[PDB]
Amino acid sequence: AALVVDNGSGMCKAGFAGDDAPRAVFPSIVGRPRHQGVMVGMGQKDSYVGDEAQSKRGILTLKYPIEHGIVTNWDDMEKIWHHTFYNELRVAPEEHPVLLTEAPLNPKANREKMTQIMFETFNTPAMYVAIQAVLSLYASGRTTGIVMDSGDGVTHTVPIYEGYALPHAILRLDLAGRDLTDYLMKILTERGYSFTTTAEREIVRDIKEKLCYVALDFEQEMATAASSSSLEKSYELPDGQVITIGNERFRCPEALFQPSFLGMESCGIHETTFNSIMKCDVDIRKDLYANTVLSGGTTMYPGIADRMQKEITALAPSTMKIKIIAPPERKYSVWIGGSILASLSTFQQMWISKQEYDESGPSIVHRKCF
Amino acid sequence: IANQPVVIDNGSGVIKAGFAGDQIPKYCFPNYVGRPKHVRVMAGALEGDIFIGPKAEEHRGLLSIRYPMEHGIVKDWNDMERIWQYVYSKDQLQTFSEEHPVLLTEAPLNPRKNRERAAEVFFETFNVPALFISMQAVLSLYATGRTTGVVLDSGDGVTHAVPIYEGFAMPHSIMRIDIAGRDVSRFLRLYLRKEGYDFHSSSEFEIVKAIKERACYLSINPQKDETLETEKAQYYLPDGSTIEIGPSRFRAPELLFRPDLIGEESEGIHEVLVFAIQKSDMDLRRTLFSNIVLSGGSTLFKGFGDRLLSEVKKLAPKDVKIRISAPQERLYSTWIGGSILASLDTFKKMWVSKKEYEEDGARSIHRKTF
Amino acid sequence: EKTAVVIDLGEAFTKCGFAGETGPRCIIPSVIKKAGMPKPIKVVQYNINTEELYSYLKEFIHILYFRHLLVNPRDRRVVVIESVLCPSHFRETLTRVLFKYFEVPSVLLAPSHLMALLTLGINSAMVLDCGYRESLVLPIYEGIPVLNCWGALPLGGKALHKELETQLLEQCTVDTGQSLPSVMGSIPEGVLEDIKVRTCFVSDLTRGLKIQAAKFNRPSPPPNVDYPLDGEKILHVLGSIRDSVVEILFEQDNEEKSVATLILDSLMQCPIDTRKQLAENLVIIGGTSMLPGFLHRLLAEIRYLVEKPKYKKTLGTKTFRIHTPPAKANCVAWLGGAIFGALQDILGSRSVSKEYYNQTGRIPDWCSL
Numbered sequence A: 001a002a003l004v005v006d007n008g009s010g011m012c013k014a015g016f017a018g019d020d021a022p023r024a025v026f027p028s029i030v031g032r033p034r035h036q037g038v039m040v041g042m043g044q045k046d047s048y049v050g051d052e053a054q055s056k057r058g059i060l061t062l063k064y065p066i067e068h069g070i071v072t073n074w075d076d077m078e079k080i081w082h083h084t085f086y087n088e089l090r091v092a093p094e095e096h097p098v099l100l101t102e103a104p105l106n107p108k109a110n111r112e113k114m115t116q117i118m119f120e121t122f123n124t125p126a127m128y129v130a131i132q133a134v135l136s137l138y139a140s141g142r143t144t145g146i147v148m149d150s151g152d153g154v155t156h157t158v159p160i161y162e163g164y165a166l167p168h169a170i171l172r173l174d175l176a177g178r179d180l181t182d183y184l185m186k187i188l189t190e191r192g193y194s195f196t197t198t199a200e201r202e203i204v205r206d207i208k209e210k211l212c213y214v215a216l217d218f219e220q221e222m223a224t225a226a227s228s229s230s231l232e233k234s235y236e237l238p239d240g241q242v243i244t245i246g247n248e249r250f251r252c253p254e255a256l257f258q259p260s261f262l263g264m265e266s267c268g269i270h271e272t273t274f275n276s277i278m279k280c281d282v283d284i285r286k287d288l289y290a291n292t293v294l295s296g297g298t299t300m301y302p303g304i305a306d307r308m309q310k311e312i313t314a315l316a317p318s319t320m321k322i323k324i325i326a327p328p329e330r331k332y333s334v335w336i337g338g339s340i341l342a343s344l345s346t347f348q349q350m351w352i353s354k355q356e357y358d359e360s361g362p363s364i365v366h367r368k369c370f
Numbered sequence B: 001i002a003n004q005p006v007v008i009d010n011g012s013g014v015i016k017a018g019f020a021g022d023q024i025p026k027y028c029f030p031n032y033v034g035r036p037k038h039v040r041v042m043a044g045a046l047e048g049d050i051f052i053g054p055k056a057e058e059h060r061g062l063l064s065i066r067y068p069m070e071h072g073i074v075k076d077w078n079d080m081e082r083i084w085q086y087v088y089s090k091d092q093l094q095t096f097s098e099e100h101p102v103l104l105t106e107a108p109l110n111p112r113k114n115r116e117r118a119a120e121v122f123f124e125t126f127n128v129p130a131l132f133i134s135m136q137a138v139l140s141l142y143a144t145g146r147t148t149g150v151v152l153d154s155g156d157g158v159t160h161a162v163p164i165y166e167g168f169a170m171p172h173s174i175m176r177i178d179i180a181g182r183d184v185s186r187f188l189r190l191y192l193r194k195e196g197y198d199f200h201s202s203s204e205f206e207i208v209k210a211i212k213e214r215a216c217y218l219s220i221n222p223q224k225d226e227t228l229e230t231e232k233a234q235y236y237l238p239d240g241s242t243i244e245i246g247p248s249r250f251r252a253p254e255l256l257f258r259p260d261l262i263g264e265e266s267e268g269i270h271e272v273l274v275f276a277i278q279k280s281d282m283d284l285r286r287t288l289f290s291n292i293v294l295s296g297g298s299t300l301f302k303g304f305g306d307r308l309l310s311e312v313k314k315l316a317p318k319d320v321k322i323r324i325s326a327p328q329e330r331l332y333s334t335w336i337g338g339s340i341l342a343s344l345d346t347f348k349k350m351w352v353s354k355k356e357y358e359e360d361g362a363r364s365i366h367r368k369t370f
Numbered sequence C: 001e002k003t004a005v006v007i008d009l010g011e012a013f014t015k016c017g018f019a020g021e022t023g024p025r026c027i028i029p030s031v032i033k034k035a036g037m038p039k040p041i042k043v044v045q046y047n048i049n050t051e052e053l054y055s056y057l058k059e060f061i062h063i064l065y066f067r068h069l070l071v072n073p074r075d076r077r078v079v080v081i082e083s084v085l086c087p088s089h090f091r092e093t094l095t096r097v098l099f100k101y102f103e104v105p106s107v108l109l110a111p112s113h114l115m116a117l118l119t120l121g122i123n124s125a126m127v128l129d130c131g132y133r134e135s136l137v138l139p140i141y142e143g144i145p146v147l148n149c150w151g152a153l154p155l156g157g158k159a160l161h162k163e164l165e166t167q168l169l170e171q172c173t174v175d176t177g178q179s180l181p182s183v184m185g186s187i188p189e190g191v192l193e194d195i196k197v198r199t200c201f202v203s204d205l206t207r208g209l210k211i212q213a214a215k216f217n218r219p220s221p222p223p224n225v226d227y228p229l230d231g232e233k234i235l236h237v238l239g240s241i242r243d244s245v246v247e248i249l250f251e252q253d254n255e256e257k258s259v260a261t262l263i264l265d266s267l268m269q270c271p272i273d274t275r276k277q278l279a280e281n282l283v284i285i286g287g288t289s290m291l292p293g294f295l296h297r298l299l300a301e302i303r304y305l306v307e308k309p310k311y312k313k314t315l316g317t318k319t320f321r322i323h324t325p326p327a328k329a330n331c332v333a334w335l336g337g338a339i340f341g342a343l344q345d346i347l348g349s350r351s352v353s354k355e356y357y358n359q360t361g362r363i364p365d366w367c368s369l
């Protein structure tokens, strides 16, 4: 009926209104080869969208217009979107209204640029963009809750109390798994696993999803893992290389708990969320203690809820019970939350049509934000 | 030991050494592993392969020379050992490891394994009672006297551009490229092969490297001089063979800044330096523009610094005064600073004793390393 | 419409035929039989007067189209089967003969491995060309010929001919009119080549080890037939002789320089994807490769060299499935040129227009502008 288009910071997801499985599950990454003196290989594309770039990853320069979600060259992602239509659903955007994703503390010019692409370029009959965390809590089925949203490009805890705007405590945080992967390939380089390009990064981010977990006592677990030679597990890679990871698996996510590893001049994720907590009414924060909504697909980690929980629990009073809300499908609950969100009665009226945009210009984005 | 410390002007392509008090590394020679070009199974061949200096500078169409440290990655450990023994001999050191303190210098992107393995040889085969491993940028700063600075090096393949203010160990400011004149000359001889000049042997290519260090420059108008019809000045080999060079005399080195047709779309350290600029802050950036240091041997080029000046001028915005310090002995600047560091009393406490190495080893290396 | 002129080239030969031509219409070498001159002067000449070459080009190209074509090519395009490393200025001398002298419609330069990729109809490939005087390996990354990874070494049959003349100095039982060890001065290498065509059989890898034993501390010289030359010049050559000339292709002692070394290291600079790719994306071209008992002995030694210390870890377990040429490996490149010129008239835009060379007088190669 509509177009529920998710814009994942890493991969992508999409589909119509009310669709259950995300159709455009492909890398939301841009890539181009080394356009040099050689000729074309039997005729082929210039830009390589997702899986195409993922396929011939040895030469295609894996880039992103995305800067922790901030798209620089909108041409990239819009051509990706065109092909995404004519790739997954093969439907024009003019017959079905679109639904998009966003993150707080985003410059409005980004969304307005996006908007004018949908109208001037895509000619969508109606359109809408909302925060991913809303879809996460939507999938949970709540309205009161601190939706700790965590994309693989950004992070933003979203405290809500009966679907109400609390942006003073809501804080965007450009925390990407890519950043961890940066540090990870760096520490691998001193471990003899010296690799440079982004193809290496794709392989090791998949390895990050393979064995990089979250321990419980980083230094103690670090010393024991240093002693636990069996924990330094190996895996013969697609290439003849094998790996060795025992510390690295949990050594790398401590940068989230400790900005010191990167010198982010910030706080660790657990107390960062607690800092966002500290910007509210402590008695409704009690509900937020119960509303420990751990969301964002970049939270699919082994031993992460107890870690984070225990940390903030040490920060919280005894009566302030942490009650984790974290379904393993929270990664899909973003797009699926938008997919079922499209089926909302009020939302079928809450729209930004052609003339609504044109006759208002990009100014309509402000009140039509949320 | 309480003797004159061995000041070493280390390197992947050029490794020299001397002592404290000396103003010059007494025996200047590059990094190379000289093996014969023939089967040394039959008696009366170039066996031993410990051909450093005149032995390598003796046989030309009979030696297939090798190179151990490849971008800070040394694999010919035993070949390094025999080169060390050549140095330890009375032609270069005239003393022993036990008899004199030794100073080791490094650069970033060096895995711990190289340091550990080299320290094993240096404290077990050779036995330095006063040995210390350090950097090279620090020594270049010692030579320049500065402490605040965007230090750069132009080794054989060693190129780190880390902005270091007042000797501040800033590992997040690390911007190291592992490529220089080595592969530049390799594809410059590929150009020679494009115009019919094959140089497949090491020495056969070492002559080409002598041209690289002799008849190679940076035409500050690369595409303009490229579009301009060249004249191709004739070079004369030790054989005296007439060889024209022309555009290729500056093509491959200008290709460092413009890696367009490499496949390895590198940067040209100015871009990497702008990335390091981003790592720094405008208040410090403004100062560090004036605080730029160059090192290594690949800096030696006609129109080198001025071309890079033009590069950054096209990069940096207005009211940005940049100064790039670069003496004539960028190679020796490391050795000069090594003698300066040798003259430091803190350095005496900074070094790891042989017994200290026996106590910990790798942990002592990476803990007492700085 | 029109059948573009597909012209094979190279250090040794220069073949040709129509677009899509299936069959060796003729085989011309890379020389010119100069009138008055008793010997056919070569064309593969470097640091030489391009003007006498320009004359060779005019005459030779003229009679060349009269050989393979017997008709003026001013109607159709010309598929120029080039390869890298040739002097681009010399290539432009060819271009000025074409446009500035014969006024051909348009031409296009393409390497041999590209046409090999056209023959297999695949995209990625790790192909080696067994050139006349040299060796030429070229990897392809899904239709993209890899630049930094390559193979190019003076490792062809010409050096083997030098080795053959060395054997002629050593093994020479030329009868009277009964040894006569190289009493006759020069040797016709073309005759020597056809002698190899009718005699140079290739042994086994274990026989390669026998040749290693022949180097230090003799086994199985037969099959071996003598060679009678006209004018009472009969001499015998062992099979171990020609097999020794084949086996010396991998002397890696103290230098680590061979064919497989070049291939392996070219793959060493490749990334993870390209590693397994080129392991399965593998083909071999070149006429010199077409030897009886050499490709499998060769392949066995390649698989053996996978067991070299720095290769089991790094490369090791990789299936080296190799594509096969549907015809003679040498002609297969020309066949790929025939493939391109056959059904690709649309690609005349990529072909170098005469107009550009008229208004330009040059062609910027893979450089700037």
Ligand SMILES: Nc1ncnc2c1ncn2[C@@H]1O[C@H](COP(=O)(O)OP(=O)(O)OP(=O)(O)O)[C@@H](O)[C@H]1O
Pocket (backbone or CB within 6 Å): A006, A007, A008, A009, A010, A011, A012, A101, A132, A150, A151, A152, A153, A154, A177, A178, A208, A209, A210, A211, A212, A213, A296, A297, A298, A299, A300, A301, A302, A331, A334
């Ligand atoms: N098994 C796993 N182990 C470790 N990490 C995982 C695992 N599964 C998923 N992840 C994390 O999920 C992240 C990708 O999920 P995420 O939904 O955040 O992608 P995204 O592109 O940011 O989507 P969006 O931008 O819509 O939030 C990866 O960075 C990875 O760290």
Ligand SMILES: Nc1ncnc2c1ncn2[C@@H]1O[C@H](COP(=O)(O)OP(=O)(O)O)[C@@H](O)[C@H]1O
Pocket (backbone or CB within 6 Å): B010, B011, B012, B013, B014, B015, B030, B031, B153, B154, B155, B156, B157, B158, B180, B181, B182, B212, B213, B214, B216, B295, B296, B297, B298, B299, B300, B301, B331
């Ligand atoms: N005139 C020159 N032109 C180009 N490159 C040079 C020149 N002089 C030296 N080099 C390069 O710089 C290297 C020496 O710098 P150095 O820092 O000692 O290198 P490394 O640290 O890799 O040994 C040489 O190996 C050579 O590659």
Ligand SMILES: Nc1ncnc2c1ncn2[C@@H]1O[C@H](COP(=O)(O)OP(=O)(O)O)[C@@H](O)[C@H]1O
Pocket (backbone or CB within 6 Å): C009, C010, C011, C012, C013, C014, C030, C130, C131, C132, C133, C134, C157, C193, C286, C287, C288, C289, C290, C291, C330
């Ligand atoms: N059937 C064959 N057996 C052995 N060698 C051959 C065969 N056919 C051609 N060759 C040789 O292999 C080389 C490939 O031919 P060509 O394409 O002319 O090589 P190049 O491109 O180096 O001239 C030539 O030297 C040729 O003599």
